[PDB]
Design a protein around this ligand. Structure first.
Ligand SMILES: O=C(CO)[C@@H](O)[C@H](O)[C@H](O)COP(=O)(O)O
Ligand SMILES: O=C(CO)[C@@H](O)[C@H](O)[C@H](O)COP(=O)(O)O
Lengths: 351, 352
């Protein structure tokens, strides 16, 4: 290791781990995706009727991050479940379900108990893990190794974005026979090529993320607001800032703001809004104005080329542009960096 | 409001009557049957559907979370509960054999209404659970249930939430009325529904105890409300109540997700309310209480009044009467409704 913290290293490693996940799998010449661990099951999975993503903590947030593109490209119901809640409810599961179990370690008890429950119902089980030979990796019918390398830190960082990328790769396989989605998977794979270079462009803003931490050093709460593709971003951002900085960070769905949580907004409540260039732009802007009109001052994580938000907002963490279903990868990096720097400022052991 | 200053307070205290009104002409406690006459032109088709989708905003979404489990149990169907804004953002796949419920006090909430029109275009059977006769959601659905809570004049939903809760329970009871193996389960639930109004009066009797808890808490900036299973909705709804009218930074936390990051926020200084009721998640909840006290947290525990071990081993507890596990969520949310109110009065705001 070269850096101070394991977490810190693992964060800056992301332009390399992403490439490792796509290694011997993606091909940018002939637009083919191929996930070896699923090559014996991919046709049976393609005939299934629902996808269930079961996980705890940040591995659950990755499901949330890729729910939408999975629905769009499989045209199947996609259900994302927190493993503890899944087991408490005795969730209905059937033989034509494909159940995914996302777990970095492959040993989290609830996610594994969920695997056994699903297997007993006769569902097709799929592992998205980072630990070869782990319990979740062995006991599932098939699976994918995200290949992000070892993770020794307490907060997941590279594991999250590589869980992300692999689920997007799975989505690209599922829709490979459909004529109408040929262009759509082209633009997604172009973005997967540009991804590591653009992740490095985000790592360039460590300066601005370091000094944003010092302003929020004394603060006790921070509301992270996000829509659609970035609901996961805000949930995951809020979870890091909880876990390692011990500040009350809560992710809030932007569309739910007017239904109650808006009350929390005043001049003294710091807000981080994720307003990016996708189909929900106008609605994210309505959420901004609702916050401003309540006298809040939001640090907006926005697009680099979004002129009417860079000038119109005091603090902006400008992020490079990618295709809508990949932006979640880029826009979460500033928040995992902010979680690290606040932890340092308060004099805590990130590891 | 006869004696009350607040509409919200009046409406919370109205809940022993509004629950009766919700069940009037639907639950028969003389022969223990359930019928929702607003559905009878579609009930055959609904009974043959292959998935329920609940679509709503805010506390109406919470009413969905609060009833997801008994709906899965009694229907044996997948039940997916969706926040309406995010439902539209994703173009969620919907099919002709889906039954889509639209939970809305007002019956006009824009996202919930657009979710309705989206589901119709795809051929799903649509059902309105509203508190407003002749509203858009009531008119545009194929069938409906009016929850009969009465006008809600407060800004925060109280009686409507719990009426929506009972409504969805009634629907669940109806869906399993032909299963021999479930007759005792549903007789249990209906006995619970019949006792429920008096058990709310007993909860409302702790208005004093809840007042004095608010005096100890109202200076605080944050409070974590933790709970599991049936009471996950209780903690999300209580967290939204405390946000909406007190402006305190409350947040609902799934008890089973504590050990995955949120537990690091717990110490001597962070207020915590845990929900520990006598149901199948008891041991899992106690585990959650052990790791909160192990990190120096001194939580207020909402619990069963005859749970002698939680009452003795914790200083401040709110002692709630026991009912059926799938109804308990009605009793355990009320103290949080009242706390939100007394917490807000102490600070001094115009609750309505
Ligand atoms: O990493 C974090 C938070 O930074 C945890 O929330 C884990 O994501 C969770 O404990 C599941 O762990 P795995 O099941 O993925 O090993
Ligand atoms: O009352 C509250 C919170 O106490 C609101 O969150 C409403 O539940 C929401 O705005 C949806 O309203 P309806 O669609 O239920 O009318």
């Amino acid at each position: 290791g070269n850096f101070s913290s394991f977490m810190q290293k693992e964060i800056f490693e992301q332009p390399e781990s992403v490439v490792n996940t796509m290694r011997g799998r993606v091909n940018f010449d002939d637009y083919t995706v191929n996930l070896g661990g699923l090559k014996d099951h991919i046709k049976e999975i393609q005939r299934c009727r629902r996808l269930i993503l079961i996980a705890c903590g940040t591995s659950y947030h990755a499901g949330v991050a890729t729910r939408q593109v999975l629905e769009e490209l499989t045209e199947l119901p996609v259900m994302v479940e927190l493993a503890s809640d899944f087991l408490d409810r005795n969730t209905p599961v059937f033989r034509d379900d494909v159940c995914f179990f996302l777990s970095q370690s492959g040993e989290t008890a609830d996610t594994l108990m969920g695997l056994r429950y699903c297997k007993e119902r006769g569902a097709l089980t799929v592992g998205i893990t980072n630990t070869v030979g782990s319990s979740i990796s062995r006991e599932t019918d098939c699976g994918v190794h995200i290949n992000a390398g070892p993770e020794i830190g307490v907060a997941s960082t590279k594991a999250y974005t590589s869980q992300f990328v692999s689920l997007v790769m799975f989505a690209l396989m599922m829709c490979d026979d459909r004529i109408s989605m040929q262009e759509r998977r082209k633009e997604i794979m172009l973005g997967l090529k540009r991804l590591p270079d653009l992740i490095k462009e985000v790592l360039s803003m460590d300066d601005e993320i370091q000094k944003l931490a010092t302003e929020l050093y004394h603060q006790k709460s921070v509301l992270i607001m996000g829509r659609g593709y970035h609901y996961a971003t805000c949930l995951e951002g809020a979870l890091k800032i909880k876990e390692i900085t011990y500040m009350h960070s809560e992710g809030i769905l932007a569309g739910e703001l007017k239904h109650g949580p808006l009350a929390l907004v005043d001049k003294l409540m710091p807000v981080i809004m994720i307003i990016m260039r996708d189909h929900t732009y106008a609605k994210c802007q309505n959420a901004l104005q609702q916050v401003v009109a309540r006298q809040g001052r939001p640090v907006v994580i926005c697009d680099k080329e979004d002129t009417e938000t860079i000038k119109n907002t005091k603090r902006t963490i400008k992020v490079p542009h990618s295709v809508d279903c990949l932006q979640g990868i880029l826009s979460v990096i500033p928040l995992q960096l902010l979680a690290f720097h606040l932890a340092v400022l308060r004099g805590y052991d990130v590891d």
